[PDB]
Sequence to fold (918 residues):
Amino acid sequence: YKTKPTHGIGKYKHLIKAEVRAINLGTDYEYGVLNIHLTAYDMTLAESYAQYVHNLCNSLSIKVEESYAMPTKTIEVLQLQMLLDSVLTTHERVVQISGLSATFAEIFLEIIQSSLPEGVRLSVKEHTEED
Amino acid sequence: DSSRASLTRVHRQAYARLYPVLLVKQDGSTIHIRYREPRRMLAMP
Amino acid sequence: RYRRRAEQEAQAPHWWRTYREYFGRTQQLLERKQAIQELRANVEERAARTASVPLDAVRAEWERTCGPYHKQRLAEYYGLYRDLFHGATFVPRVPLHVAYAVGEDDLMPVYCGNEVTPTEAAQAPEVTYEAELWTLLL
Amino acid sequence: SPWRLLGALCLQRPPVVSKPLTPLQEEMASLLQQIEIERSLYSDHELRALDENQRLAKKKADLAQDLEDMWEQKFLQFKLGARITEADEKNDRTSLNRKLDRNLVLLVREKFGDQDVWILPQAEWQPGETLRGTAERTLATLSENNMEAKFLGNAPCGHYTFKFLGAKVFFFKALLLTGDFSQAGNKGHHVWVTKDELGDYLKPKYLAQVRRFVSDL
Amino acid sequence: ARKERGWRTVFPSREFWHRLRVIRTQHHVEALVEHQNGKVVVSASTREWAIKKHNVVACESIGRVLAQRCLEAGINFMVYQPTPWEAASDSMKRLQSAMTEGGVVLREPQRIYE
Amino acid sequence: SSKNLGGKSSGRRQGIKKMEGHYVHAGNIIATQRHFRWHPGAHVGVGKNKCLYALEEGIVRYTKEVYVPHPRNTEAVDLITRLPKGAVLYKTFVHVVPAKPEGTFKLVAML
Amino acid sequence: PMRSEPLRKKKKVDPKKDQEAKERLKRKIRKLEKATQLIPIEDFITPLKFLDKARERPQVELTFEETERRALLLKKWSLYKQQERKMERDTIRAMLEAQQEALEELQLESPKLHAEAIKRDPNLFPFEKEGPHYTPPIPNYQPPEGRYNDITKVYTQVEFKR
RNA sequence: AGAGUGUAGCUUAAAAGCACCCAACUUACACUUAGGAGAUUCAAUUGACGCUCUGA
Ligand SMILES: [Mg+2]
Ligand SMILES: [Mg+2]
Fold:
């Protein structure tokens, strides 16, 4: 009898995975694709906070999907005050996020707030951008 | 808790020296940045 | 991580069909607590970032404490208990140090599972076990 | 049961200055900057400090330092604008500029008829409006300031009770962007208190456990 | 005696008479010597409260004490079959160097016919 | 018009040749297959076209064992590392329980 | 080819209006190429001006008194980050448990407050905050004691009004 | 005042296994490799400290 009372014993594809907004009405809006943008006049401090964010999210099991970088700004001394010249540059980097709740929303912002270092800026938003 | 991300190296291989430069903003506030050409000050117009 | 989990499943009951079917104190921890705390300083953590670990003192510690538990395994793997006693295990708490004479010196010892030649075992072995009436049986 | 309807908020200023770094943290910045130097490579400062030097050291027998002290003299003439508003005042604890390295909470007083309750600022919610704007109406009225000041969340942070008719209190959270606190020497008895300073400003369990929604640091 | 010559798809090969398994964990490192049946014959873990006294230094310590015990158990030939990332781990290179120099050879001589 | 052309291949004759509980001498082909359906178990080999043969003279049994692939098998180690943590794979295997003991000690002389 | 399918749908027929959208789309090709923002690359990549000039500053040594010092500071650092992470991790632990009961109370008290609390305010979308600094100050780019870096206004131009 | 009790985070673990932390690779994460850290609330199943509860 081919099949058996042990049929389906090895099925490796419903277990594994295969191959906007977050709607969720009433509880409502369970923040979806948000790009938190880490920007600094430094390089190492900006990277070390994306370091801190990404490890924070996986600790809190809320999903991250990108960690890429916006490329670098090319500005001198802006010659608005013998006219001065020295190139100070800015290093921006993207951290994405996919899963958030309403009830973790204001809290998970605080751990980003309280731990945010010297001279860096965040900016949460939705998604319409490319490199 | 502004110290959690404070201390780090350069995580790259080939790279110039970065010096402890104190840039300072329109709002009066100064910041420890890292920059070449060790002007200890930079002032942004 | 999966190989750790998957080798747990091959000891389970498994109702279907398995290859295994056809082919199968209180002062003790208190003294040990200060022991590691004391032993964490004389390594100066300078012997970490290449210590030797003298085995012979360790062996005397092993034979007293976890000798007999371990020694029961070899007496079952070699299948003494299913030939000696028809099953019916025992855990030997008396450490039996038996050895034979290679002439004058040295001693070829017998451990639990060793190999000694019958040239060495012509004459009866020199025995000590450091315990207190016994019959010894070969 | 009849329940006494009452709302609240909690306000926080952020640290505008980073924390003074600990004695273990100060060493690590020294070692990490040391190891940054030796792995470094092709320095524009040292391309002109070592190897223009060897032609200026043998032209005489046949830049680097003149640019140094100019980088020191504006380092010297610029007196650093102070991080110090602690030892000068020592007393004006209702200042918006007292602490620089830690988060604060706004803290007021109402001599009640029944008790005399030192209060973490509250509100009352009418049957029409939300619980969320019930926070929002009180920084305008109860203290007469101009705090354009973002709120965070609609779900609250703290819930403690007192039943004699039962009462309730619903603690929220918010921040400051900037501060126009009008007429700071007002006798609406208010004060800007840290975590470490409200240990002797709270008596009761209705306020003793509101530390369970502050960032502890 | 027969080695189980099959199992060409799965890992590890179950063709041996005596294997060497090591269990790297937190706070400890174990080393088991097994038969084909899964009956462990000698062991040396740092739970033993005898080598708890006196990490890589913990790993190369067991290569000293267990190669002491296989000679005391008559076990002279081994097989060590690791994942290719712990074969290049600095702990196991010191384990095998205390094991092949400690007396046993980890190579399992051939099952002679004819 | 019948644009379709080519499907005139004959049947491969691939399947179990020695079913469960059969006596199998050493070298008999237990099964022939493509796209693994039965993996080798104890005393069962694999040839180039994935057939299964018996390595010892015995009796063939079929079990359901736990599938751990080789860590160089890069097409299927990523098969593991997308499973959730309760998961094991459970392929099926073909064993040969050997019947004959591999020899006996016999008197040859009296010397 | 949805970029050029507007083009020849206007090129084939040719009224007057069809010539405006075709012309504007050539601008709107280069508008979309400046609206979507593949033209830039990262400066993660190394300039090979840094390639040959590695051999300018190679000298290092190591000493046992440095090395033993470099040992324990990292262990104390591995100690220091370990407890303060736990303090941070019990902080978020304690501030959700003071959320979780604080939601179950009003949700089991009042059904109007039940629905009102689980939504939020959409001012979390435009949130942007700047870091703590070394100096706040009481002012600034220096008010005119004798120093300044603000752009001072006599014959007033930073902008065209003043 | 009444109560449930009680192994570091967790555990039909009994001084264990997982989690966790810092490095080194990775844009980062992950993996791996080198390390790091810890508990039976205390006295003879009792008695007595820590929390969480039911109080005013
Ligand atoms: Mg066909
Ligand atoms: Mg046909």
